[PDB]
Design a protein around this ligand. Structure first.
Ligand SMILES: CCCCCCCCCCCCCCCCCC(=O)OC[C@H](COP(=O)([O-])OCC(O)COP(=O)([O-])OC[C@@H](COC(=O)CCCCCCCCCCCCCCCCC)OC(=O)CCCCCCCCCCCCCCCCC)OC(=O)CCCCCCCCCCCCCCCCC
Ligand SMILES: CCCCCCCCCCCCCCCCCC(=O)OC[C@H](COP(=O)([O-])OCC(O)COP(=O)([O-])OC[C@@H](COC(=O)CCCCCCCCCCCCCCCCC)OC(=O)CCCCCCCCCCCCCCCCC)OC(=O)CCCCCCCCCCCCCCCCC
Ligand SMILES: CCCCCCCCCCCCCCCCCC(=O)OC[C@H](COP(=O)([O-])OCC(O)COP(=O)([O-])OC[C@@H](COC(=O)CCCCCCCCCCCCCCCCC)OC(=O)CCCCCCCCCCCCCCCCC)OC(=O)CCCCCCCCCCCCCCCCC
Ligand SMILES: CCCCCCCC/C=C/CCCCCCCC(=O)OC[C@H](COP(=O)(O)OCCN)OC(=O)CCCCCCC/C=C/CCCCCCCC
Ligand SMILES: CCCCCCCC/C=C/CCCCCCCC(=O)OC[C@H](COP(=O)(O)OCCN)OC(=O)CCCCCCC/C=C/CCCCCCCC
Ligand SMILES: CCCCCCCC/C=C/CCCCCCCC(=O)OC[C@H](COP(=O)(O)OCCN)OC(=O)CCCCCCC/C=C/CCCCCCCC
Ligand SMILES: CCCCCCCCCCCCCCCC(=O)OC[C@H](COP(=O)(O)O)OC(=O)CCCCCCCCCCCCCCC
Ligand SMILES: [Zn+2]
Lengths: 147, 62, 75, 226, 141, 107, 230, 141, 73
């Protein structure tokens, strides 16, 4: 939904190991995408094709362990083991387990105030309310007088 | 951004103070003259110092 | 499995939030019948002014089947 | 954040040419002594060595696994510092709106220096008043003269330094057992054999450990024209 | 669209105020806590309470707006979007076609008629003895 | 229009019968032209000027809180005379709303 | 952290450019003016170099600031043409009955409209390629051919016209309005000669500026064509 | 117990969030593009559309569909030769999935399968496929 | 902006080009192309010239022919 669907960064693959898109001026090589789709297969067709991530089977015991320790993570790990995890499924897993940072007010050092001053907090609030009461009434009084 | 212009930097300490050979501190030009005349009046004016404060600003004849 | 060609999918809706964008009741998406009526009138006035040059200088003789205070006379 | 520009290519990964050529010393350097580039490759070499050894992952604890990948375990102190960093960064290009400040819960005004200019706009609705600007200096509980809103300055300071992501990592992360170069070699042979190099960082890293330009094709890899 | 707008056509940074509709609400949701139920009195404020990354939805919005910038494939838009992107280009091209195949023929015809009859075919012939082509746009006379 | 903060009757009830509005002086003091010392060089006169800023002054109330120098506009918030670089850290304009989110609280 | 803006402390092009301007007034030979104009072109290029180097700051608002500046400049160009149209139409009551030959409505208008429309189509294709991260070498040379024909046609028209600036206010306004459009066409040559492919693509203010400017010139000619030729 | 970790993104401008250590491990694992590979699964309708753009791929894609293979595109270009291995690979992967899924919780022993036919794995790292982007026909025929 | 579906209802693919076999009639192809790329650009682009052309060429009857037959003197 940004930049007309063109990602800012994406992977491109080449079949010839010694290929350089800047040095060579040949006209036979066809670049591939991150999933390996050749460039002459349009995206409206390739995006419909279902691509899933395949990890070596030696990773299955590890993926099983992750699911058991975190049951909410199990359905995503199962998809990965069974070769049913697409890129979208991976993204859902990634953002589901992202948490925000916590700020603790109890750790903030406070400006210095003596014990006697801390006991006068109610008094100062009381004075502030009376100032506002006097302020609001005077506005009506002055408005009538000067106008 | 790492390496960008810092949002805050502490001032380095000022350069060493200079003393004359006899030990008197060295003075520097100062455009705050003490005018010579017989007037000694002092006028004070209550001045706005924000919205909730004032300052008693004084003007001295000298 | 079954898939939909992205080219022929429908436009995504605006998100429903505290700040929701809505153009449905504005009626500014396309020119309406009133605009095309204005175009029709402009064509008619253009043709009419050229065809009938004396229309702007009408005759003053007034003849009414039911007089001048009858509705058909007014128009 | 909204005020940041596009991600660069380096924001994702660094080119292998930036790998330090003295890998043997890199893997022995303490974290506090590693620079940004050195720290990046220490974590990537050590992190990918553990991840590319499937048979050992299930028996590795999350604490050890996080250490190998270079991820910092969160605790209340580190979480507090990181949280205030992000809040400071967010406020660089975002509005400052929150609950009304009181003595129990003063408005927090993050700052790096000893002072930051703040404005009070009062409460909500009718209680909102004209902007009243004041200089919020450390060590004073500021009280708006009009609405009596309480402000306080929070300084991102620690031991002659201001809080940063790297500073938090160095202060709280503890270096574990020294990385063993045998693991690098063992994983290297696992994924790199007979001209197939599926573990390329290790291939370069192993080549640097053996000197430079020892493994097949590395001399041609390091020869450049300009 | 050609012109850059921070709100809608933000192609310089790609920032989007809301996440994609693909994600389930549990995974990611628009940053809206206007409907939060009243806080119990016994709860105590731990965080700042300031609008910012401490809120989960805003943190995920910032994270996604940075990590969406790398994707394996294109996110193909529908033909309606593609039409709108080059609306001016296509219309200018059709305007060129109209000039060549509509305006050109009748403009050529008028000049040929003017040659023979001294005035364009869409003009009243004069009887006042003045010579020359005369006006072209008759309705502006 | 703004007419001050709203006040409820209960908020005006004192906890003692002898309470009266505090008589704290909000006149910051007596001032004049900043008077430098001839012995101070350019660097130390700069320190002198930075220590004479009225906008860094405040009045401490009886509960330890301070009411600072305040102004309608931020023009009065920079050091006087204005330094070359003024707002190194972006001044924060604090807005207030009734919205809240659960993550900020703990039970 | 870092400051929101990387301040620019000093600059010396302003003095040079201002002095270059003064040299125009204090010349004793028109040859100095020709060489002075080259200096102005050089120093303006240096100023454009500073704008490109500012990309290193990675400031998101830089693109927006320059874009809105161009919008203001475009408005000033439009209002300048409005004044010429104002001048032309003020004396409208004195036109069409004086013994001068006004321009034909068949030849010049049609080919110029066709020619300038092709110019728009070329620039549109450039924009489309810029959207697709793609380049076509031939496009620039089509613009040069287009500009060559426009120069060749306008030069002949002025030389073969049988009426002069001093003949009537009508002729003065015709020549002046056409020259003002030409100058804006020449300014387009100044801009388009450097068109290249840059790999940072849609964060380059030059592409959007060129598309807007070329469109403005062409639409202005439509107004001119209706006023003078048709 | 799963500790929470800090996850940072970006090089010069760094954004930090709290994340799941296991998820991050998976995330970095999927970044090993040479080890973890995306594979394509086809359906009959999509295979037919491929022919509109590459006739040879359509025939090779049809073979993959007929055998229900999840196949990498590079391998697909050699499906004529790799088919016997790909069928063997499919069986071994299915065996491993069944064993690990069926194992009781807390049992993290490695599955028993023939890794020599599964690519990429330490037992078999794959073949050095030559590029097929060369012409064979003579234009004048 | 009001979200709305894609109005194109013609064929989405003709198949691989094989020496121009099994393809629709040319006129049908032109209609499909304009449907695919949008009739709104066609109408907008042609509107200005059609309006100007009709107004000018209508004078052949409105201004020339009618005037000769309609002059009361
Ligand atoms: C009869 C037959 C003959 C006819 C002849 C006609 C002659 C016409 C001559 C025109 C000359 C060319 C001018 C335009 C050149 C560029 C063309 C171009 O690129 O177009 C395609 C392109 C389409 O954009 P897009 O984003 O792809 O849009 C996609 C969709 O179209 C959908 O887009 P969207 O709707 O989603 O919106 C996005 C887009 C939509 O915008 C556009 O696309 C703009 C299209 C404009 C085309 C021109 C049409 C004519 C406009 C007439 C305006 C008259 C103004 C009032 C005059 C009063 C006189 C008394 O927004 C922008 O691009 C924003 C641009 C910035 C606008 C800045 C405006 C500043 C002035 C504001 C008014 C000031 C007065 C206030 C008074 C009240 C005070 C209380 O347009 C642009 O991108 C151009 C923007 C940059 C140039 C803007 C120039 C502004 C000049 C302001 C002058 C103000 C003067 C005020 C004082 C006057 C009295 C003293
Ligand atoms: C018994 C007796 C019977 C008697 C029977 C008599 C029969 C009589 C029949 C009369 C028929 C009358 C019909 C009236 C009703 C009409 C209904 C209708 O359809 O109206 C709407 C219809 C079309 O309006 P629409 O529906 O809104 O259009 C739909 C669009 O698709 C909307 O979609 P869109 O907005 O997406 O459209 C595309 C748009 C999308 O926009 C964008 O992409 C965004 C950007 C837009 C801003 C662009 C900024 C600038 C762009 C820069 C590029 C410039 C390139 C060119 C450069 C040139 C350089 C030289 O972009 C553009 O369109 C603009 C860009 C394309 C190139 C622009 C070229 C320059 C235009 C300005 C100059 C025009 C004057 C030129 C003059 C010649 C040359 C000097 O309006 C008309 O056709 C006008 C009505 C004309 C009425 C004439 C009446 C008088 C003539 C009568 C003739 C017959 C009389 C015969 C004698 C009879 C005696 C009895
Ligand atoms: C048996 C042979 C029969 C031949 C019949 C005649 C055919 C002549 C066709 C000429 C078309 C020229 C169009 C000019 C516009 C620009 C074209 C363009 O974009 O080129 C890109 C093209 C490649 O650009 P790129 O950036 O590498 O690739 C961009 C794309 O990605 C990839 O670009 P692309 O590949 O898509 O390009 C598509 C196409 C796009 O353009 C078109 O398709 C437009 C087609 C318009 C047809 C015009 C025909 C004119 C004929 C009039 C004859 C009148 C006779 C009157 C008799 C009167 C009797 C009283 O562009 C071209 O193919 C341009 C022509 C390439 C030839 C280059 C080699 C030098 C000239 C060789 C001429 C040989 C003539 C032999 C005649 C033999 C007769 C038996 O540019 C070049 O090749 C470099 C510049 C040279 C191109 C223009 C050459 C002009 C030659 C004119 C020959 C006719 C003269 C007639 C004089 C009559 C006097 C009375
Ligand atoms: C079974 C029923 C079949 C019916 C078939 C009907 C066929 C009708 C064919 C009509 C052909 C009309 C051709 C008109 C061409 C005029 C060309 C012309 O004037 O060229 C000159 C002019 C430039 O000359 P200048 O000297 O510069 O003067 C103008 C500017 N100063 O150039 C142009 O006009 C170029 C544009 C060419 C327009 C071509 C129009 C072709 C129209 C074809 C219509 C076909 C209809 C078929 C209907 C089939 C129904 C079953
Ligand atoms: C007499 C009438 C007027 C003619 C006389 C000379 C007037 C000179 C006034 C020139 C004003 C220039 C204002 C420019 C404002 C816009 C600048 C701008 O956007 O430039 C950047 C933009 C894109 O750069 P990026 O690095 O991608 O991004 C930038 C950072 N985001 O770059 C460009 O626009 C490239 C410009 C290249 C061409 C430069 C040509 C300079 C021409 C100067 C003409 C001087 C002629 C003097 C003649 C004197 C005698 C008559
Ligand atoms: C449908 C598309 C076209 C729309 C056209 C809109 C036109 C808007 C005009 C705005 C300005 C109106 C000014 C008031 C009208 C006055 C006309 C008038 O009196 O004309 C004669 C008078 C001269 O008479 P005297 O001084 O008494 O004696 C002269 C003896 N030699 O002329 C003037 O003063 C008028 C000059 C101003 C009009 C021309 C220039 C201004 C118009 C610029 C238009 C620019 C393009 C269109 C912009 C709007 C686009 C949406
Ligand atoms: C600064 C100068 C600018 C240039 C000068 C402009 C001056 C005029 C500007 C007008 C506004 C232009 C935009 C109009 C948009 C539009 O069409 O707007 C279309 C709208 C209808 O809107 P929708 O159809 O979109 O809902 O039409 C109207 O509201 C009015 C026009 C409809 C027809 C009116 C009929 C008039 C009848 C007159 C008497 C006829 C007698 C006949 C006897 C037989
Ligand atoms: Zn306040």
């Amino acid at each position: 939904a940004y930049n007309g669907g063109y990602p800012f960064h994406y992977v491109v693959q080449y079949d010839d190991p010694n290929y350089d898109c800047e040095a060579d001026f040949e006209f036979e090589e066809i670049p591939r995408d991150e999933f390996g789709v050749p460039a002459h297969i349009p995206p409206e067709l390739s995006t419909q094709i279902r691509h899933t991530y395949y990890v070596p089977p030696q990773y299955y015991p590890f993926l099983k362990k992750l699911g058991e320790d975190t049951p909410e993570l199990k359905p995503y790990t199962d998809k990965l083991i069974m070769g049913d995890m697409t890129y979208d499924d991976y993204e859902e897993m990634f953002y589901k387990f992202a948490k925000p940072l916590k700020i603790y007010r109890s750790r903030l050092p406070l400006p210095y105030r003596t014990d006697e001053e801390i006991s006068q907090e109610k008094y100062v609030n009381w004075c502030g309310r009376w100032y506002s009461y006097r302020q609001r009434l005077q506005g009506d009084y002055y408005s009538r007088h000067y106008f | 951004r790492i390496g960008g212009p810092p949002v805050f930097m502490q001032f380095p300490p000022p350069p060493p103070k200079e003393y004359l050979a006899d030990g008197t501190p060295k003075t520097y030009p100062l455009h705050q003259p003490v005018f010579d005349h017989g007037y000694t009046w002092e006028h004070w004016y209550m001045t706005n110092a924000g919205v909730f404060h004032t300052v008693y600003y004084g003007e001295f004849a000298k | 499995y079954k898939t939909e060609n992205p080219l022929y999918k429908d436009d995504e809706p605006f998100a429903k939030t505290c700040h929701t964008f809505d153009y449905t009741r504005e009626g500014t998406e396309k020119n309406g019948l009133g605009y095309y009526c204005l175009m029709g009138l402009w064509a008619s006035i253009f043709i009419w002014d050229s065809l009938y040059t004396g229309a702007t200088m009408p005759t003053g003789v007034h003849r009414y089947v039911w007089g001048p205070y009858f509705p058909t006379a007014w128009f | 954040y909204r005020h940041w520009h596009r991600m660069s290519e380096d924001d994702w990964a660094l080119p292998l040419d930036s790998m330090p050529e003295d890998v043997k010393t890199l893997m022995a350097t303490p974290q506090t002594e590693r620079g940004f580039v050195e720290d990046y490759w220490y974590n990537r070499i050590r992190g990918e060595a553990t991840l590319l050894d499937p048979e050992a992952l299930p028996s590795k604890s999350y604490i050890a696994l996080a250490r190998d990948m270079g991820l910092q375990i969160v605790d209340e102190p580190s979480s507090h510092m990181m949280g205030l960093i992000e809040l400071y960064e967010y406020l660089r290009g975002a509005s400052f709106v929150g609950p009304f400040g009181t003595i129990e819960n003063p408005v927090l005004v993050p700052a790096v220096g000893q002072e930051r200019v703040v404005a009070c706009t009062g409460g909500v609705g009718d209680e909102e008043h004209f902007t009243l600007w004041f200089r919020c200096r450390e060590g004073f509980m500021y009280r708006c003269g009009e609405c009596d809103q309480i402000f306080m300055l929070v300084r991102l300071y620690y031991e002659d330094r201001y809080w940063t992501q790297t500073l938090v990592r160095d202060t709280f992360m503890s270096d574990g057992d020294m990385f063993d170069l045998k693991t690098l070699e063992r994983v290297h042979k696992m994924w790199n054999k007979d001209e197939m190099v599926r573990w390329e960082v290790g291939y370069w890293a192993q080549d640097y450990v053996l000197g430079k330009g020892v493994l097949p094709g590395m001399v041609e890899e390091h020869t450049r024209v300009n | 669209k050609h012109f850059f707008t921070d709100g809608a056509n933000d192609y310089v940074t790609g920032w989007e105020n809301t996440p994609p509709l693909k994600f389930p609400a549990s995974v990611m949701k628009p940053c809206d806590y206007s409907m939060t139920k009243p806080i119990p009195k016994h709860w105590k404020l731990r965080g700042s309470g300031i609008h910012g990354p401490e809120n989960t939805d805003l943190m995920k919005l910032v994270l996604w707006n940075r990590l969406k910038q790398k994707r394996p494939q294109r996110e193909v838009p529908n033909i309606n979007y593609l039409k709108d992107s080059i609306r001016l280009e296509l219309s200018v091209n059709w305007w060129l076609m109209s000039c060549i195949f509509l305006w050109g023929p009748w403009l050529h015809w008028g000049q040929e008629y003017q040659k023979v009859h001294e005035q364009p075919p869409w003009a009243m012939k004069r009887i006042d003895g003045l010579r020359g082509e005369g006006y072209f746009t008759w309705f502006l006379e | 229009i703004y007419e001050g903060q709203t006040v409820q009757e209960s908020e005006l009830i004192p906890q003692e019968d002898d309470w009266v509005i505090e008589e704290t002086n909000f006149c910051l003091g007596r001032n004049c032209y900043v008077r430098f010392r001839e012995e101070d060089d350019l660097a130390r006169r700069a320190l002198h000027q930075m220590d004479s800023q009225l906008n860094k002054m405040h009045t401490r109330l009886r509960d330890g809180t301070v009411i600072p120098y305040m102004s309608f506009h931020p023009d009065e918030m920079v050091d006087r005379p204005a330094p070359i670089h003024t707002f190194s850290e972006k001044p924060l304009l604090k807005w207030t709303w009734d919205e809240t989110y659960e993550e900020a609280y703990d039970d | 952290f870092e400051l929101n803006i990387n301040i620019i402390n000093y600059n010396y092009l302003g003095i040079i450019i201002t002095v270059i301007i003064s040299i125009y007034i204090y010349n004793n030979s028109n040859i100095i003016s020709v060489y002075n104009s080259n200096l102005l072109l050089i120093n303006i290029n240096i100023w454009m170099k500073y704008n490109i180097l500012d990309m290193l700051n990675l400031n998101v608002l830089d693109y927006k600031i320059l874009l809105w500046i161009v919008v203001i400049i475009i408005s000033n160009e439009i209002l300048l043409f409005v004044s010429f149209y104002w001048i032309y139409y003020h004396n409208y009551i004195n036109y069409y009955h004086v013994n001068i030959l006004i321009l034909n409505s068949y030849n010049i208008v049609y080919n110029n409209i066709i020619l300038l429309t092709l110019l728009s189509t070329i620039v549109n294709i450039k924009f489309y390629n810029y959207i697709l991260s793609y380049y076509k070498y031939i496009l620039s040379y089509l613009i040069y051919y287009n500009n060559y024909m426009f120069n060749n046609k306008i030069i002949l028209e002025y030389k073969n016209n049988s009426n002069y600036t001093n003949d009537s206010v009508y002729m003065t306004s015709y020549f002046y309005i056409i020259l003002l459009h030409y100058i804006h066409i020449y300014d387009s040559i100044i801009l388009i000669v450097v068109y290249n492919y840059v790999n940072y693509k849609n964060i380059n203010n030059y592409y959007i500026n060129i598309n807007i400017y070329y469109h403005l010139i062409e639409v202005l000619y439509i107004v001119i064509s209706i006023l003078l030729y048709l | 117990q799963v500790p929470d970790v800090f996850a940072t993104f970006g090089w010069e401008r760094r954004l930090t969030v709290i994340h799941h250590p296991g998820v991050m491990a998976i995330s970095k694992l999927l970044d090993q593009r040479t080890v973890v590979k995306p594979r394509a699964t086809f359906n009959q309708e999509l295979v037919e559309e491929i022919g509109d753009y590459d006739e040879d791929l359509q025939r090779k894609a049809q073979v993959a569909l007929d055998n229900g293979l999840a196949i990498e595109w590079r391998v697909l270009d050699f499906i004529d030769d790799e088919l016997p291995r790909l069928l063997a690979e499919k069986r071994e992967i299915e065996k491993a999935r069944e064993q690990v899924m069926s194992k009781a919780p807390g049992d993290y022993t490695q599955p028993v399968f023939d890794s020599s036919v599964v690519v990429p794995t330490p037992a078999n790292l794959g073949r050095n496929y030559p590029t097929l982007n060369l012409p064979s026909g003579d234009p004048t025929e | 902006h009001i979200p709305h579906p894609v109005k194109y209802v013609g064929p989405r693919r003709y198949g691989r080009y094989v020496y121009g076999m099994n393809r629709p009639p040319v006129l049908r192809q032109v209609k499909d192309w304009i449907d695919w790329t949008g009739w709104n650009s066609v109408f907008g682009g042609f509107s200005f010239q059609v309006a100007f052309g009709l107004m000018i060429v209508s004078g052949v009857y409105l201004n020339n022919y009618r005037a000769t037959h309609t002059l009361y003197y």
